[PDB]
Amino acid sequence: ACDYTCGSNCYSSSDVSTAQAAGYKLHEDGETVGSNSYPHKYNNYEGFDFSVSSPYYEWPILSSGDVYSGGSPGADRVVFNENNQLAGVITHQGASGNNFVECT
Numbered sequence: 001a002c003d004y005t006c007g008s009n010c011y012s013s014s015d016v017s018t019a020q021a022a023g024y025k026l027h028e029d030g031e032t033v034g035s036n037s038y039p040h041k042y043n044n045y046e047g048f049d050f051s052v053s054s055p056y057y058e059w060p061i062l063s064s065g066d067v068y069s070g071g072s073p074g075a076d077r078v079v080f081n082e083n084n085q086l087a088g089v090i091t092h093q094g095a096s097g098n099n100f101v102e103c104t
């Protein structure tokens with residue numbers, strides 16, 4: 001229903017929940033996938049106004065609807081904390097360098 005718009009990508013609440021659930025599970029088990037080994041800590045260099053407390057972890061959310069399994073992560077990420085609360089949804093689309101902007 002387009003709850004989150006990351007550039008040209010559109011994600012529903014359930015899309016985010018599904019991605020987040022998968023990312024948190026690997027985190028619990030101490031597993032990582034991909035050349036950038038996700039999920040990993042997100043330091044919030046961008047200084048986003050997150051309402052949930054740290055630490056935060058970034059995990060890829062795919063436009064195709066599939067759960068990330070180590071391949072190409074793309075530009076979008078879901079950010080969750082240790083309580084498995086959604087901190088936010090961010091993206092490299094529309095940003096410079098390796099910076100992020102929040103999906104609206």
Ligand SMILES: Nc1nc2c(ncn2[C@@H]2O[C@H](CO)[C@@H](O)[C@H]2OP(=O)(O)O)c(=O)[nH]1
Nearest residue numbers: 036040041042043044045046058098099100
């Ligand atoms: N842009 C950005 N990168 C972060 C942050 N936290 C950790 N990183 C990592 O710090 C480096 C510089 O941005 C990258 O390795 C990046 O990981 P990702 O590339 O996986 O996002 C953050 O809050 N913002």
